Design a protein around this ligand. Structure first.
Ligand code: HDD
Ligand code: HDD
Lengths: 726, 726
């Protein structure tokens, strides 16, 4: 009726590259992609086609265009129950956003272990290489609201809901291996300091303001995670190209009752990759939804995000083996000292149907563990256990949040709990208490055991007085920031310097900048001096003579802490901008697209207008976006084929497209007379590494380009970009 | 004591220009700024200095750094009531955001009428020129969440709470004179279409997506307000430089019972000023809080936002004398036919103390009127009256939202309502019903009268059948969009074309773009043709033969609809970037700052690092921000004094500063050897209009620059900017 005659409104129910088709609810885009959790949601999924429009009570609506009034130009009547029901539901759509991590993007998937881990844990989802566990994963920022932007400088959340046969296990982690603070009692202080300031509620999604750096300067325990946030780790290219960490030391418990200390890791199969600051900041304006969009479209394209689960394992007798306290969440465990042992793989392969119902209402909580796992006395973890249950009473409207469909266990659950707001389950048990005789005491307790047993805490020894006191072993603040610093490449170190420098320049009270620079001088004097230089601060002789902190158990570096030191690039799922002209050389475009498709690299055809152009072939080329509509920020490299280059040679948008990408260190490839654009980016006739150029886009032209893309960015270009006006 | 000895942590409690000092709660920044509402809030204002840190129950806390645990490396104890109270409050901080207009910034102020209006309304706050009414005003966007960006393309809200002696009057308006839809029954449809789409919750703060333009293409009633949104009205420079409108026709009722139709207007004393799209979009990334910050800092500087309240007045016998229906909210009343008559002045002169408590919790509702005002049968207004009461039950936690301090009337309030969540008032009335004898029927009804009388509705005639039916008089959709289009300058028209073009290029389904272009052809074929060519669309012969709509009561143009046809910009409160070098020519800087001060124009001194530089005469210049930290987006003009120009001539950030300013049509002034920068912006030796240049910054130099600033932007430069790579 209102759909177009040609059916061009519906996306195909098959994988398609980003921007090819309109995005769609997961059940409509990929109906053949299934798992036990997705199937269990069938009871609450609602269709639409061939159904009448009704009230919520089932009454068909004849006229959904008008209120009921006395005369067609008269007052609206109170008896219009259809209008009032519709407006009432609208009026109450919103619920409180998460206190932290309010901005997030989520997807369905499954996990599978590589081998049985029965020797170290009795957890059922790790017991058998053929046990598939559905998952729901939500990635997030930390500071900003649910409507804030994606590519901010911040920590990222990485929360995984495991729907196991013995209960929900929530692995609630971040993208760095430590947190800012040591004891949960300080969590409201730290969060209030990083959040928008209370008088005017500025700034959104940014730590670059006085109260954050005030707190940091007075609490050196924060410096380690601050180092990570100021590095390019704070601006990932994609949720698909960052690491995950549980941060805390947990425990594994095997059938014989032996405990092993464990820290959890997620390693991205797509490799580690981050933006650079100028690109990330501008991208929050050009596309505040970039990461959300990029995740959704990768899944629709079949570039399923994949992550390997890994364990750092520490025997109980090695609790005190390292310089740092194992239970201190501001300290990491270097992989040089304790390797990450691979455990299994997780694949995210379907988007939700309704963002609010599945993402916004999802509730993750690290206290949701299962038999075979346990906690430790990490005093940050200890307080988290209180928070994630408590907070849901207001956010999700009461204690039945486990009945919201996305949150439901796929395994059975039965107990004597009753009532509460929006109670869905109707209990037939004659008893609502135990011990009872009137239902023969069902449901019954289960003794602990090797499988399908009841939960019992590990009986660890407790000895001490009731004290509010920090462990002295936690009182070391500079050695891990320094190890992180020393493990970065030189260009990563420069980016850290520029992060501190840019943020401290937004601090209005100069003494705070100075006090932060003083803390940096306790970490590394090269770092401190470089930041000071950019702030017009001069270190004193006392600061220049601060003794550096000790090495971490003899380490001078750990290359696993760098994003880039150990190559792990993968071009699959990346995207290239192809800048068209009105008579493209079809031979160039043919060879370009063939090579990109063979490596799984997507392309977007850009022009100065929408519609189509015709190549020299007579081939009609559809235009994905304009140069301004899809800035170089949104792509990984730029290719300019030959053709009628005079068409775009004096186009300001086209020339700036290349300058912006050049500034942000991206690979650029120019064919034929497109090489004339070298003048725009101040490249000499002789060329330079990172600019592919040839008479035509044939032979090794695309191999060179794809090799550059596998290395992510052209770091050697950095000394040249400070002269580029872009 | 953690504060610096020199007291530099504390801003001065006197007016200071933007950036000079840290911002502060209004009671601390401007303690002497008072009004009756601000005084009435004193009962709930909390101090801090010289108080002990306590629990919410008043118990002093000894150690706010640690949880209570069994041993200093032990588990946290459930008996830690201090921890659990602190974390519980943190866990429940967030409340639901507003369904629409969730993003907004507010201030305190006062209103005064110019003359008694007793002849046309018995409203007490308009009865006496010596009667001052306190106000609380919230400006907002519409689509995005509370954490979204300020300078988006959107309609803006302009809500004013008048605390009158006869009750609260809320004037809840927008910055355009019409709304998108005719009947409130369709509000959830329109809002769902513009909001982030439901499968993936994209895009934030943007109408540039499929579902919005789908709805528009199928509901031509939306086209008038769409035209306004696509113009530079949709991207204001500042809440201080936009207009406000009540949109609906309301009624004024005088003491003799005579009704006059009225539409409400706010006219900014700072004049009308807007950004351009590329600037606004980039600014949502460089400073998503730009409007919130600019409002707060203008008030701290003494640049108080001021607006003139004005009335369009139509006698009852003139109801049907126009080509359009007065009760249709998609139609404006041209000022050429019905002039805005000046009524009074509103000054916003103090910021809040706590954003959440005063801004986030404020509740405005257009059903809050007072005797002397009444409604009409406008079917959008009619449904609004239901919604603003209903929505607060969830957003503010129940029916006692009028007891939240910011919402409280300053006049008396007494009735027989009782109980409800968070009930504050403790009633002593023996009776909670009327009629009653046990309290001699107090509080009592009051007959209507000329002053201090009870509210009685105007007894307008109602005749017709109970129908869900649109008024035939509303069935015209193109003549007011055409009137707006033909009232704009040629460069405003270009920006409208480019607004439609940019947004429709982000619509993935091409037939939606085609259907919108077809709607445009029913408005004006020059507009339709210009948009279609940017989309690669060819109008058909039939489309080129669509008859345009007629003039609106003889009007092709109304001058009041253009932002700029008659410039009315005050330069006071604007800001100029001054690009420093390491040996600035002090004679230049003296002349520059002398002239800016005389016009109340602020300055920010920028450089490549923070700290200080020394001028050629030894003056130490403090640096406000770096070139990258305070981009040209954030200022109105750029001046480059002479000095050691070689220091910055090769700086890529400095050159780009000018190129970005140039592209966005801002005045630029270059003294002495700084004229070398003309090459970067491709200005010929001979000069051009909008680039001020001379051997030195003298008297004539700064007059030319400030004359350009008075005209806001250099529109004559538009033909040159498409060749600039920026
Ligand atoms: C004692 C308070 C407290 C502390 C110390 C932490 N958190 Fe937390 N976190 C919360 C209290 C909280 C919360 C208030 O309970 C949130 C907000 C809303 C919610 O459901 O849980 C939350 C949300 C939250 C989310 C978002 C989950 C989602 O997508 O819904 C993640 C990923 C984390 N946290 C991760 C961490 C990590 C890695 C921490 C340090 C190791 C951490 N949190 C410390
Ligand atoms: C029947 C539904 C409905 C309709 C047709 C409208 N609104 Fe509305 N408006 C609401 C339902 C609503 C609301 C849902 O009740 C809000 C959101 C939360 C709230 O407190 O009120 C609101 C908020 C709201 C605000 C923000 C107030 C603040 O700062 O808190 C403004 C300025 C407006 N509206 C203005 C308008 C204008 C100028 C309209 C057309 C002439 C309009 N609204 C139509």
């Amino acid at each position: 009726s209102l759909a177009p005659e040609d059916g061009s409104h519906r996306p195909a129910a098959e994988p398609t590259p980003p921007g090819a088709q309109p995005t769609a609810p997961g059940s409509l885009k990929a109906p053949d992609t299934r798992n036990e959790k997705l199937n269990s949601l069938e009871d609450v999924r609602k269709g639409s086609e061939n159904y009448a429009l009704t009230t919520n009570q089932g009454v068909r609506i004849a006229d959904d265009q008008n209120s009921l009034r006395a005369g067609n130009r008269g007052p609206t009547l109170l008896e219009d129950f259809i209008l009032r029901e519709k407006i009432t539901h609208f009026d109450h759509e919103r619920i409180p956003e998460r206190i932290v991590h309010a901005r997030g993007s989520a997807a369905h998937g499954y996990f599978q272990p590589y081998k049985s881990l029965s020797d170290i844990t009795k957890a059922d989802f790790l017991s058998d290489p053929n046990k598939i566990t559905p998952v729901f994963v939500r990635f997030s920022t930390v500071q900003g609201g649910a409507g804030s932007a994606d590519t901010v400088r911040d920590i990222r959340g990485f929360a995984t809901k495991f729907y196991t046969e013995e209960g929900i296990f929530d692995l609630v982690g971040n993208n760095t291996p430590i947190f800012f603070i040591q004891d949960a009692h300080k969590f409201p202080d730290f969060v209030h300091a990083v959040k928008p300031e209370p008088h005017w509620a500025i700034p959104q999604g940014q730590s670059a303001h006085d109260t954050f750096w005030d707190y940091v300067s007075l609490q050196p325990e924060t410096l380690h995670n601050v180092m990570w946030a100021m590095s390019d780790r704070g601006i990932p290219r994609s949720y698909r190209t960052m690491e995950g960490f549980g941060i805390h030391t947990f425990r594994l418990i095997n059938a014989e009752g032996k405990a092993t200390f464990v820290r959890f890791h997620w390693k991205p199969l797509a490799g580690k990759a981050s933006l650079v600051w100028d690109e990330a900041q501008k991208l929050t304006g050009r596309d505040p939804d970039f990461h959300r969009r990029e995740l959704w479209e990768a899944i629709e394209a079949g570039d399923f995000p994949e992550y390997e689960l890994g364990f750092q394992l520490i025997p109980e007798e090695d609790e005190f083996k390292f310089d740092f306290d194992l239970l201190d969440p501001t300290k990491l465990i270097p992989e040089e000292l304790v390797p990450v042992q691979r455990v299994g793989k997780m694949v995210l392969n379907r988007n939700p149907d309704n963002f609010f119902a599945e993402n916004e209402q999802a509730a993750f909580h690290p206290g949701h563990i299962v038999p075979g796992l346990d906690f430790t006395n990490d005093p940050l973890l200890q307080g988290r256990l209180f928070s994630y249950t408590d907070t849901q009473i207001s956010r999700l409207g009461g204690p039945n949040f486990h009945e919201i469909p996305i949150n439901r266990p796929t395994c059975p659950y039965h107990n004597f709990q009753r009532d509460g707001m929006h109670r869905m389950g109707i209990d037939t048990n004659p008893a609502n208490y135990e011990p009872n005789s009137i239902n023969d005491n069902w449901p019954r307790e289960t003794p602990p055991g090797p499988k399908r047993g009841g939960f019992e805490s590990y009986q660890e020894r407790v000895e001490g007085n009731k004290v509010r006191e920090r462990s002295p072993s936690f009182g070391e603040y500079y050695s891990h920031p320094r190890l992180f610093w020393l493990s970065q490449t030189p260009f990563e170190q420069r980016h850290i310097v520029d992060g501190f420098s840019f943020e401290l320049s937004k601090v209005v009270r100069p003494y705070i900048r100075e006090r932060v620079v003083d803390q940096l001088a306790h970490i590394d004097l090269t770092l401190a001096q470089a930041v000071a230089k950019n702030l017009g601060i001069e270190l004193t002789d006392d600061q220049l003579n601060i003794t550096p902190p000790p090495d971490v158990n003899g380490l001078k570096k750990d290359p696993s802490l760098s994003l880039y030191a150990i190559p792990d690039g993968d071009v699959k799922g990346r995207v290239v901008a192809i800048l068209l002209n009105d008579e493209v050389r079809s031979a160039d475009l043919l060879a370009i697209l063939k090579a990109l498709k063979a490596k799984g690299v997507h392309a977007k055809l850009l022009y100065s207008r929408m519609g189509e152009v015709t190549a020299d072939d007579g081939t009609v080329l559809p235009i994905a976006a304009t140069f301004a509509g899809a800035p170089s920020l949104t792509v990984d490299a730029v290719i300019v084929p030959c053709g009628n280059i005079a068409d775009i040679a004096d186009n300001g948008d086209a020339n700036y497209y290349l300058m912006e990408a050049y500034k942000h260190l991206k690979p650029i490839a120019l064919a034929g007379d497109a090489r004339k654009f070298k003048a725009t980016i101040k490249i000499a006739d002789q060329g330079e590494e990172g600019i592919v150029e040839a008479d035509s886009a044939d032979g090794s032209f695309m191999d060179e380009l794809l090799t550059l893309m596998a290395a992510h960015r052209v770091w050697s270009r950095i000394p040249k970009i400070d002269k580029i006006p872009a």
